[PDB]
Amino acid sequence: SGGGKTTSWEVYLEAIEQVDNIKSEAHVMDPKAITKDQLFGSLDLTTREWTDGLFTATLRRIIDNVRGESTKRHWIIFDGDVDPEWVENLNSLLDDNKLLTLPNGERLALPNNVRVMFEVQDLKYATLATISRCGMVWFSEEILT
Amino acid sequence: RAFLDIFYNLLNNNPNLVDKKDPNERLVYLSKDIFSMTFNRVTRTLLNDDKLTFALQLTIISVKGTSNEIEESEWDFLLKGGDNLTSIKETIPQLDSLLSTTQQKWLICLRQQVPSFSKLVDHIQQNSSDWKQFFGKDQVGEPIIPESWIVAQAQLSNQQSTIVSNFRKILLMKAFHSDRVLQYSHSFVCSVFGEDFLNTQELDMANIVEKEVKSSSPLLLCSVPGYDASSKVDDLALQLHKQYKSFAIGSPEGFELAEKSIYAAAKSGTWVLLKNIHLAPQWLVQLEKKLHSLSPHPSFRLFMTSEIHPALPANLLRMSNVFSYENPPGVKANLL
Amino acid sequence: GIGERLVQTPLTDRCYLTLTQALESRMGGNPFGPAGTGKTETVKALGSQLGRFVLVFCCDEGFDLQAMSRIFVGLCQCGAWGCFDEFNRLEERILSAVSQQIQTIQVALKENSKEVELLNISLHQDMGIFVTMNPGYAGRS
Amino acid sequence: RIDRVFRQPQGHALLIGVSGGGKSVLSRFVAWMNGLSIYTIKVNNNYKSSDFDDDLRMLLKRAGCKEEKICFIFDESNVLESSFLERMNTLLAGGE
Amino acid sequence: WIEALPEISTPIWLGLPENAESLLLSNKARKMINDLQKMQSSEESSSSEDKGKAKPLFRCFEREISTGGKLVKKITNDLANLLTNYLRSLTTSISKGIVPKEWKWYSVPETISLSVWISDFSKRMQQLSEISES
Amino acid sequence: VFTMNPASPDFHNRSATSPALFNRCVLDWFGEWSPEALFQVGSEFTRN
Amino acid sequence: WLSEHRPLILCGPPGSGKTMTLTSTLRAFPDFEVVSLNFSSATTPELLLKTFDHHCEYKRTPSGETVLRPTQLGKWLVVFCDEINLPSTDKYGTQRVITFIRQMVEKGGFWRTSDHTWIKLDKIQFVGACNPPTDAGRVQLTHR
Amino acid sequence: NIYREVITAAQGEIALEEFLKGVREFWTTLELDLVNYQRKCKLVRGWDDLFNKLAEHLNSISAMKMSPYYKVFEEEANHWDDRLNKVRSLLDVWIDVQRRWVYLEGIFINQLLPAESTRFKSINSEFIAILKKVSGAPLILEVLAIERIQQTMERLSDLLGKVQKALGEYLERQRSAFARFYFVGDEDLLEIIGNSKDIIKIQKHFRKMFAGLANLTLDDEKTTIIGMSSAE
Amino acid sequence: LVIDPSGQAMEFLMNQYADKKITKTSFLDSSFMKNLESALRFGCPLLVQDVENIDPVLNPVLNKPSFMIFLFTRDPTAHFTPDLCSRVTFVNFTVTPSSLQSQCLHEALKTERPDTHKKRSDLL
Ligand SMILES: Nc1ncnc2c1ncn2[C@@H]1O[C@H](COP(=O)(O)OP(=O)(O)O)[C@@H](O)[C@H]1O
Ligand SMILES: Nc1ncnc2c1ncn2[C@@H]1O[C@H](COP(=O)(O)OP(=O)(O)O)[C@@H](O)[C@H]1O
Ligand SMILES: Nc1ncnc2c1ncn2[C@@H]1O[C@H](COP(=O)(O)OP(=O)(O)O)[C@@H](O)[C@H]1O
Ligand SMILES: Nc1ncnc2c1ncn2[C@@H]1O[C@H](COP(=O)(O)OP(=O)(O)O)[C@@H](O)[C@H]1O
């Protein structure tokens, strides 16, 4: 905590909108502030009624140029704790796959103008399956003397 | 409730008690026919290996309160066979010309523990021309206890009994030949109940599930992973003339649907069967609590099948004639 | 389409044989080992190599049963490939459910049976069931 | 001592003690006196939170709405589930 | 030819050295023995007080003593509590005949009597030492 | 009125979970039936 | 600390003077409507939400967003969390109720799982109390 | 002596009296808690609540018949037993019709299954017509007074059931006709069946039937198929 | 609250009060709650197997027209709670070494010598 993380990607994204002129919109959200079923969605075992999730939807608004999201780069930072839970439902997206499929066989594809990230304090509760397909960027606190 | 039966059949249906009627004389038989009969019912559930283990306990218990009673200090050493060995700094230097490092400590634990094994160190240090081959490595002749010791010790104690002398060999062997313990133990047990005792008699599923088991207790058959007892029941069911109704206790529609067959079966008196009951770890628990309370008709013989698995709730096997099955040794048997 | 193609390593082949040779024996394939080797990918590569329609059934999750029972009808008919990724991760309850089903299809499939009696449906020869997982315990599967 | 507690806004009692020692019986008494109404929680092996919450309403209303003197005796063998304490907790603190 | 075959079959038939049978008989004799040491206890303490009386390559070695030495303090400070959730189970195995969980910091055969595990660790420690001064 | 027992297995547990308990209500430790009580309750029950 | 509206914590023993010390100082503030929330082991981020839909209000600014402001006009709401360090941690050391707060303090808003629309806090600050994590049932607070 | 057997008897009877008071005042006024349904109708909510109250009272009425004071309020006790019972029986078949309808509602495509799309209109007709006589007089005891509603709702149950059964028989055929179809849940299937023309509203479902085939190619006319495009 | 694992006790009661009619129910099948109300009022012995999972709905009875409930336990180590211990009268039946030895000595004398049994029987 307090190493320059939240600030780093904030300057990077803000600066890229000039070297590319394209808007680098991001979407932060604590993956622990809400129940897992709200971060990806679930199925109502009474009518197959699917209740959308936070990430599921936030990934949709991009594939559907409702406001013209394709006209720029995206970022979905999970500023929250990391565990081998809400991360497994992404494996088929963090690697070659690129499709956050859902129990209802929604199969949500991942464009190339969209990027997913994490801003965790630690990974002591993370398995070799969580990170694996992810970009590790150490942010020692010693940076910000 | 199971034991009490062997006890009962001992006083009544004893195959060797059908003759003589004198009670004073009959007692002689029962006093011994208890271990034999008991071991027979139990040995049907005990896996080959464990078969002998139990035999020993019954022995020490039989020769109890007799001139053959084993010293609680010796049986204490058999189990507590110098388990502390990994911390005996004392030594036996005047014998380095025979026993080795870790080999020496053992002789001490024996002398240190059991009393009837204190003069040992000396007997060996004396006529070493006897124990030479015993401790003697490359011995193209299964190690042998010097008859000098077996007797020199027998008299060195009022305990001049054969059975006692036999047991003792095990102790000596456990300390210098941990691979002869299984053998010498067999010899000891036999000298008490006869070499015929441990003779694994072939079963006879006839009298068993028909004239030796009430409809109250099933016949669970815990087999070994890689073998199925299924066929066993089928071959006997049809070749006996009776009802039947197997069931795959694993599928979804196998739980509820099946049970019915069991209820009615016990109501009229028909045979049933349930294989791989282990596949249903959470179900069997229910069967138990139920089966327990439901007096069936004499012509009932609910069967069960699975592999030795911890799943089977204790209350399950306990209320039934468990039969352990396992592929025997030898290459011949495998081929056939 | 363009899809993905693994690298025919000396293992990918020794594996390609065990499956084909075993798949020819009217029996499903089961590649065990420490997660992260090819268990799933290789299986998918084989099917894609034979112009088949392999399917990856993700377990260790909410694995729907009411859905699985159905999909099987498709595999048997279409003649597709059913690959269960981490098939050992299913809850004992569910794991016992599916297992019982695969037992039905695979058994009847070894007898040539033109139609299975799952859940009578048509059974296609090209259909195949694959179950991946971690190595058992001391050699046992 | 049980009386003192009753005659006082937000007066609750935490009687710790051996079983069948008079904890309930003696509490019912002092309650019956000051005009309080003892309300129990008839439970069983087949209860639930969807049940406690419901009854938590019959009570909460009888006090806040109908201004009545109730003496809710809550025995340990009643918390047949965690949630029960969470409710009893806030209820004790801010009667809500 | 098969029926005419002798029941018993030695380990030589399996291309194994005749001695092989000696190892099997030994373990089987031990397991049987161990069982009798249980069916005796169930049909019938201050241990810690005793065991307490004990206690380019440059890169590798450094860790060998670091990670290992760290275990020394653990065993000393953890056991010293002879006279929570962890401290509880840590004493179960000591009274059941198994090496307490959190202690196995190094590769050691599953079935290894308590008395031995500790002994090894002791000698295994003087190992790291002799390297220090060296 | 909370009526629990000192023996109850989950004793020191029903505490930490809910602070209001040992912080709001008045804790009157009934304790065990004192020797003086046992005597009086016995003489009073065997009077007739 | 109260002027800047920071989630200060009044750590101290039982009856030290925490709850009191605060309520008194809060008086030196004209527009400071306080609310008392009693946390525990079950106090999840959801419960904290229930209190909002009973003191605050979701309004859609002329801009197009949607702010969460205290019902009373021109008044700062003070959400006082009595036993804030008691919330139980999941199977991965995480007091969801704390992360939820941090998300509203640093970020300034929380996602409303129903229409997935960012809800920014207007005039709703925080202030909690508790005992040192040294005491039982207590759970150290995340450095985040 | 005798002065205590009457006093207690008088109090033991007023209890049965008091009991019936809450029952006679709870059902002769209790109105079905309806809720608007997407501006098409209004279903009945709070089932478990109605059932629990019906079961409770019915249990106390059946047991209070072994009381030395039951003989008095025996006529009113048995009356409620009848009324309350008919109420629980009607609700059971109703909660079935309520559901059986809701499902089939979001479906009836219709031009493909007339044999059943028509059989539903007859059910949907009287249903919305009867629900009006209910929404107006929510008195649970009044609605139970409609012209043989039991024989009417039981018919809607059967009918509505006979329809859904045919559906599964149709969907089952659509699949046996196109193997792949077994991969798409009943949900997406019904959608794929209705959009037989608007290929656009189907493009998104292909990935769950064919391996690489992700999107079909249409000619400049946008009516005929030309080729196929893979996700890549 | 008969703590009888050997089952001898249960077998004793079912044969002792077979006249007064007894129901071998338990806290299992729903038939329980229905059986109690029957035995309770209509008067007649009972028997609730597996008391490990007893419901706090019986309390009113375990503390008081003409019947008797028999709580049983097949678990010889069943660790109960204070409440249950107080409102119940424990009856241990676990067969110890000495006890069983006595059962055999009798069941053997009554058979391997019934004559010397008619003497003590009839006489005394
Ligand atoms: N180059 C810099 N020099 C001095 N201070 C900085 C610099 N960059 C960021 N900071 C300050 O240090 C803090 C770093 O926090 P940050 O790492 O961005 O958040 P988090 O800890 O949540 O990842 C910020 O609040 C910011 O005000
Ligand atoms: N022969 C190979 N050629 C190319 N890549 C391979 C090969 N074998 C394994 N891999 C890579 O290693 C990873 C193994 O993961 P996968 O096999 O999908 O999981 P699991 O090992 O659990 O079955 C794949 O993502 C793949 O890219
Ligand atoms: N001082 C007393 N004299 C006689 N009987 C008493 C006395 N105190 C309690 N009892 C008896 O002991 C029982 C205690 O029950 P109760 O108070 O409801 O449970 P608890 O004490 O466990 O809360 C009562 O039924 C009562 O008859
Ligand atoms: N300076 C003070 N002036 C008046 N009362 C005080 C003072 N300090 C402590 N107290 C008393 O001590 C009690 C402390 O309780 P409080 O602070 O509300 O709980 P906590 O300390 O657990 O937050 C108050 O009831 C108050 O009467």
Q: How far apart are CA C88 and CA E104, in angstroms?
A: 28
How far away, in angstroms, is G6 Cα from ligand 4 center?
23
Q: Is A137 exposed, middle or buried (0-12, 13-18, 19+ CB in 10 A)?
A: exposed
Contacts of G59 (CB under 8 A, 6+ apart): G66, G67, G68, G69, G122
B293 shares contact with chain I (CB less than 8 Å): yes
CB C58 within 8 A of CB A89: no
Q: How far is I67 from chain D, CA to nearest CA, in Å? A: 22
CB A12 within 8 A of CB A115: no
Task: Judge if the beta carbon of residue A111 lies within 6 A of ligand 1.
Answer: no
CA end-to-end distance (rounded Å), chain B: 40
Q: How far apart are CA A103 and CA A105, in angstroms?
A: 5
Same domain, B236 and B128: no
Domains plus CATH for chain A? 1-143 (3.40.50.300)
Contacts of I121 (CB under 8 A, 6+ apart): none
Q: Residue B246 has which token pair?
A: 């197997």
Q: How far apart are CA B231 and CA B228, in angstroms?
A: 7
Contacts of C125 (CB under 8 A, 6+ apart): C79
Which ranges of H41-139 does DSSP label H, i.e. alpha helix? 47-63, 74-105, 114-136
Domains plus CATH for chain C? 10-141 (3.40.50.300)
> Which sign does the torsion angle of CA C72, C78, C79, C84 carry?
negative
Same domain, B177 and B215: no
Of the listed ligands, the closest to the CA of A145 is 1
Would you say how long chain A is, in residues?
A: 145
Q: Nearest Cα to B251, choosing from H185, I42, C118?
A: C118
Q: Residue B24 has which token pair?
A: 């004073």
Q: Residue I103 has which token pair?
A: 């059962």
CB G47 within 8 A of CB G33: no
Q: Residue C128 has which token pair?
A: 């195949």
Q: Residue H223 has which token pair?
A: 């009516």
| Cβ contact A88–C61 (<8 Å) | yes
Angle of helix B48-62 relative to helix B181-193, nearest 10 degrees? Answer: 50
Of the listed ligands, the closest to the CA of F36 is 3
Q: How far apart are CA D28 and CA D37, in angstroms?
A: 9
Same domain, B204 and B163: no
Task: Tell me which chains share at least 3 CB pairs under 8 Å with chain F.
Answer: D, G, I
Specify the 3-state DSSP secondary structure of E102. helix
What is the separation of C-alpha B203 from the centre of its chain, rounded to a whole number of angstroms?
A: 16
How far away, in angstroms, is H203 Cα from ligand 4 center?
69
Q: How far apart are CA H19 and CA H21, in angstroms?
A: 5
Q: How far is I108 from chain D, CA to nearest CA, in Å? A: 46
Q: Residue A140 has which token pair?
A: 């020692």
Which residues have CB under 6 Å of ligand 3?
D 19-25; F 3, 41
Give the DSSP H or E segment for G69: strand G67-70
CB A108 within 8 A of CB A100: yes
CB H30 within 8 A of CB H140: yes
Residue B33, domain CATH: 1.10.8.1220
CB C118 within 8 A of CB C101: yes
Of the listed ligands, the closest to the CA of A12 is 1
Q: How far apart are CA I32 and CA I28, in angstroms?
A: 7
Q: Which of B8, B26, B293 sits opposite I112 (nearest CB)?
A: B26
What's the one-letter identity of residue B239? Q
Contacts of H205 (CB under 8 A, 6+ apart): H184, H188, H191, H192
Backbone angles phi, psi at G36, to 5 degrees: -100, 115
What is the separation of C-alpha B46 from the centre of its chain, rounded to a whole number of angstroms?
A: 6
Q: Is C29 exposed, middle or buried (0-12, 13-18, 19+ CB in 10 A)?
A: buried
CB G38 within 8 A of CB G82: yes
CB contacts of I104 in chain B (<8 Å) are 7
Residue E45, domain CATH: 1.20.1270.280
Q: H/E/C letters for each residue in chain B? A: CCHHHHHHHHHCCCCCCCCCCCHHHHHHHHHHHHHHHHHHHHCCCCCHHHHHHHHHHHHHHHCCCCCCCCCCCCHHHHHCCCCCCCCCCCCCHHHCCCCCHHHHHHHHHHHHCCHHHCCHHHHHHHCHHHHHHHHCCCCCCCCCCCHHHHHHHHCCCCCCCHHHHHHHHHHHHHHHCCCCHHHHHHHHHHHHHCCCCCCCCCCCHHHHHHHCCCCCCCEEEEECCCCCCHHHHHHHHHCCCCCCCCCECCCHHHHHHHHHHHHHHHHHHCCCCCECHHHCCCCHHHHHHHHCCCCCCCCCCCEEEEECCCCCCHHHHHCCCCCCCCCCCCHHHHHC
Which of F10, F17, F24, F27 is the best mutation test for G, with the most CBs of G within 10 A? Answer: F17
**E strands in D1-96:** 14-16, 37-39, 70-72, 74-75
Q: How far apart are CA B175 and CA E84, in angstroms?
A: 42
Q: How far apart are CA A135 and CA D79, in angstroms?
A: 48
F46 shares contact with chain I (CB less than 8 Å): no
| Cβ contact G45–A52 (<8 Å) | no
C141 shares contact with chain B (CB less than 8 Å): no
Q: Residue A122 has which token pair?
A: 């630690």
The phi-psi region of residue B248 (left if phi > 0; otherwise alpha if psi is between -120 and 50; otherwise beta) is beta
For ligand 1, mutation pick of A7, A30, A79 (most atoms within 8 Å of CB): A7
Q: Is C59 exposed, middle or buried (0-12, 13-18, 19+ CB in 10 A)?
A: buried
Q: How far apart are CA B149 and CA B125, in angstroms?
A: 12
Return the CATH superfamily for domain I1-114.
P-loop containing nucleotide triphosphate hydrolases (3.40.50.300)
Specify the 3-state DSSP secondary structure of H225. strand
Backbone angles phi, psi at B306, to 5 degrees: 180, -170
Residue-by-residue DSSP string for E25-67: HHHHHHHHHHHHTTTTTTT--TTHHHHTT---THHHHHHHHHH
Q: How far apart are CA B28 and CA G70, in angstroms?
A: 96
Distances (CA, A) of B331 to D77, E26, E42: 63, 21, 39
Q: Which of A28, A34, A125 sits opposite G92 (nearest CB)?
A: A125
Q: State yes or no: D79 annotated in a binding site.
A: no
Contacts of H103 (CB under 8 A, 6+ apart): A47, H164
Query: Which structural domain, as residue segments, surrounds residue B82?
Result: 67-198
What's the one-letter identity of residue C36? G
CB contacts of A130 in chain C (<8 Å) are none
Distances (CA, A) of C49 to C12, C41, C44, C46, D62: 12, 12, 8, 5, 74
Smallest CA separation from ligand 3 atom 10, residue: D22
> Which sign does the torsion angle of CA I33, I35, I38, I43 carry?
negative
Strands B219-223, B303-307: pairing is parallel
Q: How far apart are CA D9 and CA F8, in angstroms?
A: 30
Q: How far apart are CA I80 and CA D69, in angstroms?
A: 36
Q: How far apart are CA B52 and CA D88, in angstroms?
A: 61
Beta bridge pairs of residue D14: F2
Smallest CA separation from ligand 2 atom 20, residue: C36
Q: Nearest Cα to F1, choosing from D14, D19, D55, D36?
A: D14
Eight-state DSSP code of residue I26 = B
CB E90 within 8 A of CB E101: yes
Specify the 3-state DSSP secondary structure of C82. strand
Q: How far apart are CA H112 and CA H117, in angstroms?
A: 8
Same domain, B152 and B169: yes
| Cβ contact C64–A129 (<8 Å) | no
- Nearest 5°: the CA angle H143, H148, H149 is 45
Same domain, B250 and B169: no
Same domain, B61 and B89: no
Q: How far apart are CA H8 and CA H15, in angstroms?
A: 11
Q: Which residue of D has its CA nearest to I54?
A: D45
Which ranges of chain F does DSSP label H, i.e. alpha helix? 13-16, 35-43
Q: How far apart are CA A56 and CA A101, in angstroms?
A: 9
CB B285 within 8 A of CB B255: no
Distances (CA, A) of G82 to G19, G26, H142: 7, 15, 52
Same domain, B144 and B209: no
Q: Nearest Cα to A68, choosing from A29, A37, A38, A23?
A: A23
Strands G56-59, A49-51: pairing is unpaired
Q: How far apart are CA F3 and CA D71, in angstroms?
A: 12
CB B251 within 8 A of CB B333: no
| CA-CA-CA-CA dihedral for B228, B234, B235, B238, to nearest 10 | 180
- Nearest 5°: the CA angle B111, B116, B117 is 30
Q: How far apart are CA H90 and CA H149, in angstroms?
A: 8
Eight-state DSSP code of residue H180 = G
Same domain, B47 and B100: no
What's the one-letter identity of residue F22? F
* Maximum Cα–Cα distance across chain G: 49
Eight-state DSSP code of residue I49 = B
Backbone angles phi, psi at E42, to 5 degrees: -75, -5
